[PDB]
Design a protein around this ligand. Structure first.
Ligand SMILES: CC(C)CCC[C@@H](C)CCC[C@@H](C)CCC[C@@H](C)CCOC[C@@H](COP(=O)(O)OC[C@H](O)CO)OCC[C@H](C)CCC[C@H](C)CCC[C@H](C)CCCC(C)C
Ligand SMILES: CC(C)CCC[C@@H](C)CCC[C@@H](C)CCC[C@@H](C)CCOC[C@@H](COP(=O)(O)O)OCC[C@H](C)CCC[C@H](C)CCC[C@H](C)CCCC(C)C
Ligand SMILES: C[C@H]1O[C@@H](n2cnc3c(N)ncnc32)[C@H](O)[C@@H]1O
Ligand code: MET
Ligand code: SF4
Ligand code: SF4
Ligand code: SF4
Ligand SMILES: [Fe+3]
Length: 493
């Protein structure tokens, strides 16, 4: 064995803060911890030690300025955001309901299993948005979740509100069932929705039977069909990855998304996180980590995408630092922990093969130049020109006009969000974020968390502490018993 780090974790029994050791063992990264009352625990932290060490070099420590709570009990008990948090809200979640038209066996929110209805008012949601916009820099992206947001009749008005509040990106996490109605999808599109974060467990029926309790695959494909018909070209497929259920369909999901790249902008795989409601078989067997996913991509894409093509999230953090000094304005920085997730971008050519952007562009060299020019940054245009002149030396699909890609990359360096958006329409994002549970919790990771829930009590809580420590507290305070809520609201709320 070989000790890598010391950190703090949580006891899976009593959720107490306990010491933890991260160590290399048989080519894998495991985490060991000891609760003074419940003994010692062991879990797989990362399935590949070599990729763990490689990602460790992209560490980036951010900074916050606007807080909502104070230091009282220490991390992870002071969410949030307390003075010791190291990242501002990049993507915010607002749970608009705990009601749902499904009853999935796997659900980190554990919806419908409380006998109480949590549905913040339009005015509560606007106040939560104001808290998010008060940050420095203001939160640029917001996602409605739950729960199933489409069971609220005012969801189009909520989407319009997010646009009126200044959010550049408005996202909808949904099972997509109500989106089989093409007129409703039109209402969401006209309301200003940016992206549909679509639950999508596989390309065959069995993953939906195991994870959702029924075959939703025809409904999923109908949603994709309706998105083509109305021109909604920003869909992200979200497979909950479970070993023994859909780890064999990683390539199939990618290939199906590539066939529909006109509407599908990405696939964000989510390894099953043992929070909320998990069936006893998935809880015991289906533990999979980020490098295990990277291995599945390389195996099930026949080498088209390799482990060299995947980068951690904070690798692009210096890009925001460069634009920040280039414009003298605070920019949202992807300062999450290097072991929270990974991503790559691929182009789809004529035959259908997948060319990662790392295949024909020296991304590691581009980031190297960006880091070099941060110290040096009339001279700023020369720096941009030097970058513009050094970009051809770091460069491929024939159907890709590489000259417009260069212009969009350089425009992104000028805080041009519309260039960032247009650049994503040329590519297919393949990513994976592994949310922590009580078994693999790492305080050093969650301190840099960039994905936060806005709560009705004026707090902003990192995703991984909210779903392990805070969700029941918050929802119970602001919920109404089901029997009384039904008798005071219509089916739409
Ligand atoms: C270069 C490589 C080596 C990799 C480098 C590192 C890599 C980590 C960098 C990643 C950067 C990336 C996240 C940046 C995304 C920017 C992008 C969203 C900007 C907008 O990009 C354009 C959007 C569409 O937006 P519009 O054009 O405004 O609206 C069009 C509208 O439909 C009009 O009808 O499509 C595009 C849609 C996007 C693709 C959507 C991305 C969504 C995220 C993946 C969502 C992540 C969610 C979290 C895991 C939280 C989940 C919470 C849940 C569990 C409740
Ligand atoms: C060029 C090639 C070779 C390499 C890089 C490829 C490229 C596609 C990567 C892009 C990475 C970006 C972070 C870079 C953007 C850089 C910014 C400085 C651009 C600034 O312009 C947009 C600013 C808004 O600024 P103002 O409000 O002041 O006008 O951020 C507003 C935009 C922000 C970024 C909103 C982001 C929205 C999404 C939904 C947030 C997701 C958050 C997750 C933590 C990330 C996903 C993680 C994976 C593992 C799922
Ligand atoms: C918001 C997205 O999260 C997915 N999802 C639901 N439960 C879990 C879990 N335990 N782990 C990971 N992802 C999950 C949903 O299927 C939806 O697509
Ligand atoms: C707990 S998941 C909440 C979002 C939505 N119900 C989905 O499954 O995609
Ligand atoms: S996760 Fe962040 S906000 Fe929450 S207690 Fe830790 S440092 Fe503070
Ligand atoms: S995972 Fe989503 S769709 Fe399934 S029960 Fe939970 S909230 Fe509803
Ligand atoms: S939500 Fe969890 S996995 Fe994602 S950045 Fe925050 S702490 Fe890391
Ligand atoms: Fe304990």
């Amino acid at each position: 064995s070989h000790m890598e780090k010391k950190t703090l974790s949580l006891c899976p029994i009593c959720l107490k803060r306990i010491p933890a050791t991260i160590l290399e063992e048989d080519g894998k990264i495991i985490i060991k911890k000891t609760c003074p009352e419940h003994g010692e625990f062991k879990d797989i932290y990362w399935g590949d030690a070599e990729l763990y060490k490689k990602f460790d070099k992209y560490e980036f420590i951010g900074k916050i300025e606007v807080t909502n709570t104070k230091v009282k009990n220490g991390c992870p008990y002071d969410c949030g955001l307390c003075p010791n948090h190291k990242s501002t809200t990049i993507l915010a979640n607002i749970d608009v309901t705990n009601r749902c038209n499904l009853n999935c066996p796997i659900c980190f929110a554990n919806a419908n299993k409380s006998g109480k209805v949590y549905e913040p008012s339009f005015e509560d949601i606007k106040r939560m948005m104001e808290n998010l916009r008060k940050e420095i820099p203001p939160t640029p992206a917001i996602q409605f979740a739950g729960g199933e947001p489409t069971v609220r009749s005012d969801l189009p008005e909520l989407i319009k509100l997010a646009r009126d509040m200044g959010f550049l990106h408005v996202q909808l996490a949904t099972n997509g069932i109500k989106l089989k109605n093409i007129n409703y999808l039109k209402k969401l599109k006209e309301a200003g929705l940016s992206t549909i974060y679509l639950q999508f467990d596989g390309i065959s029926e069995k993953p939906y039977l195991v994870a959702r309790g029924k075959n939703l695959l025809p409904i999923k494909q109908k949603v994709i069909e309706n998105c083509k018909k109305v021109g909604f070209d920003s869909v992200v497929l979200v497979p909950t990855l479970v070993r023994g259920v859909n780890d064999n369909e990683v390539g199939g999901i990618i290939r199906y998304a590539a066939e529909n790249v006109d509407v599908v902008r990405g696939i964000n795989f989510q390894p099953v996180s043992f929070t909320g409601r998990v069936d006893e078989k998935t809880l015991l067997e289906g533990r999979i980590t980020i490098p295990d996913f990277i291995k599945l991509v390389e195996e099930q894409t026949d080498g088209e995408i390799t482990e060299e093509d995947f980068y951690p999230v904070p690798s692009v953090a210096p890009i925001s630092v460069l634009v920040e000094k280039l414009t003298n304005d605070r920019k949202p920085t992807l300062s999450s922990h290097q072991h929270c997730g990974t991503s790559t971008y691929v182009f789809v050519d004529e035959d259908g093969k997948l060319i990662p952007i790392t295949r024909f562009i020296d991304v590691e060299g581009f980031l190297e130049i960006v880091k070099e020019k941060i110290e040096e940054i009339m001279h700023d245009v020369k720096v941009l020109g030097e970058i513009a002149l050094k970009l051809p030396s770091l460069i491929a699909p024939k159907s890709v006009n590489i000259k417009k890609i260069i212009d969009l990359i350089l425009s992104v360096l000028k805080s041009d969000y519309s260039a960032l958006a247009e650049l994503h329409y040329h590519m297919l994002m393949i990513s994976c974020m592994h949310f922590m549970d009580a078994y693999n919790f790492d305080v050093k990771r969650v301190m840099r968390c960039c994905i936060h829930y806005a709560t009705p009590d004026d707090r902003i809580i990192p995703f991984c502490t909210y779903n392990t420590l805070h969700r029941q507290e918050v929802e119970e305070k602001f919920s109404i018993p089901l029997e009384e809520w039904k008798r005071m609201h219509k089916i739409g709320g």
